[PDB]
Amino acid sequence: SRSESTIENFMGRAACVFMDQYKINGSTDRFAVWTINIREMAQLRRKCEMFTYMRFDIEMTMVITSCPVLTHQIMYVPPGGPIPAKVDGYEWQTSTNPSVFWTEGNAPPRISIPFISVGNAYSSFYDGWSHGTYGYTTLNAMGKLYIRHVNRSSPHQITSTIRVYFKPKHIKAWVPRPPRLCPYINKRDVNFVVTEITDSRTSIT
């Protein structure tokens, strides 16, 4: 009767973790970056922060709109990959960086990322230093997701908005952890404001 209380049923469901737009013609506003992390959405972050160590594969499904036939390149760089600094940068042509070519009107593109960490599990919490900077390790680095129009130009001005749906797959988790009481201040650190344990009451009876 508790089948749905499993980690796969709990953690594994797609959520719209990244909203961004990118123009087709005109500098740095012509592509979208999104360094992949589990700390983007505050609702998904509270779930991944119940476990200290997690191990899962990633299946992403991009949802691209627009405002000719438009073709989009969604290039995924591995954690050691070269990052483009301009829409025309040579780094888009790298063979090592897998990319999908999706033209508008078809089913949305789907790309699947394995467990790419150097260690044995991703860390939700890191009590330690890089040297440095506290709470950051390069073991839970999952790459970036560079997205652009492959079209050279358009007579009209076209602005394309992309939604990324992040779904963990084959989730494995270790070391349970209490759910977070305080709200989130920043997306990189674990800093908090001292909050009350629970809503108050008039008396003890």
Binding site: S1, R2, E4, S5, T6, I7, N9, F10, R13, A14, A42, Q43, R46, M50, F51, T52, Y53, R55, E59, T61, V63, Y76, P78, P98, N106, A107, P108, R110, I111, S112, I113, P114, F115, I116, V118, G119, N120, A121, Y165, K172, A173, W174, V175, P176, P178, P179, L181, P183, Y184, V194, E196, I197, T198, D199, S200, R201, T202, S203, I204, T205
Partner: protein, 219 residues
């Protein structure tokens, strides 16, 4: 080739689908799995762990350690010691525990809640406290006599320091659990009169949870 018909539902992105997907890097050889202690296969393994219940969550002190401490010993016997609604969801006493925070992810849950009361007073102190549970339909007892004429347990504090009780029919007007001075805290000249009681709520080994939803805690 083979004759094929595309049914309705082709070329759609159902967000909750479970299709096999083409991997970005098939060549990549994943790191072999390693044994890490604490494998979590179910979330009711989290809710089955006892956690301290902030019964004393009065308006003044819910940002200190005094929210957990039930003050006993200083002290009329007419008014109960404490009283709180039993349901974990939508009850400020059990709303934010290991048990309650897991149950706020699920629309429907049915099970039993186990309460454990720990007496944190001196070893020389002694007395009796009457813990009464009233069924969901029934009204809260007004006196110790009406609480005695029901489902209760007279807990001798000098004898044993922990009192465990498993409450049934906790699922979604719920049950009320109360405590009464049956006997004042009898103390020698050396030991301090005022004592504290801690509570521990956890799953009573069932807890089926069916319809997962979004937590009402994070905005």
């Amino acid at each position: 080739g083979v004759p094929v018909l595309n049914t309705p539902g082709s070329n759609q992105f159902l967000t909750s689908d479970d299709y096999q997907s083409p991997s970005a890097m098939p060549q990549f050889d994943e790191t072999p799995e390693m044994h890490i202690p604490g494998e979590v296969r179910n979330l009711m393994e989290i809710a089955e762990v006892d956690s301290v219940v902030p019964v004393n969550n009065v308006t003044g002190k819910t940002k200190s350690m005094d929210a957990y401490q039930i003050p006993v010993g200083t002290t009329d016997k007419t008014k109960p010691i404490f009283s709180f609604q039993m349901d974990p969801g939508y009850s400020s006493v059990l709303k934010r525990t290991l048990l309650g925070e897991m149950l706020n992810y699920y629309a429907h849950w049915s099970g039993s809640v186990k309460l454990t009361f720990l007496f944190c007073g001196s070893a020389m102190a002694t007395g009796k406290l009457l813990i009464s549970y009233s069924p969901p339909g029934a009204s809260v007892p007004t006196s110790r006599k009406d609480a005695m004429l029901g489902t209760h347990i007279v807990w001798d504090i000098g004898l044993q320091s922990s009192c465990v009780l498993c409450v049934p029919w906790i699922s979604q007007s719920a049950g009320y659990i109360t405590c009464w001075y049956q006997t004042n805290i009898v103390v020698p000249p050396g030991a301090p009169t005022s004592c504290d009681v801690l509570c521990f709520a956890s799953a009573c080994n069932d807890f089926s949870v069916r319809l997962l939803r979004d937590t009402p805690f994070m905005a």
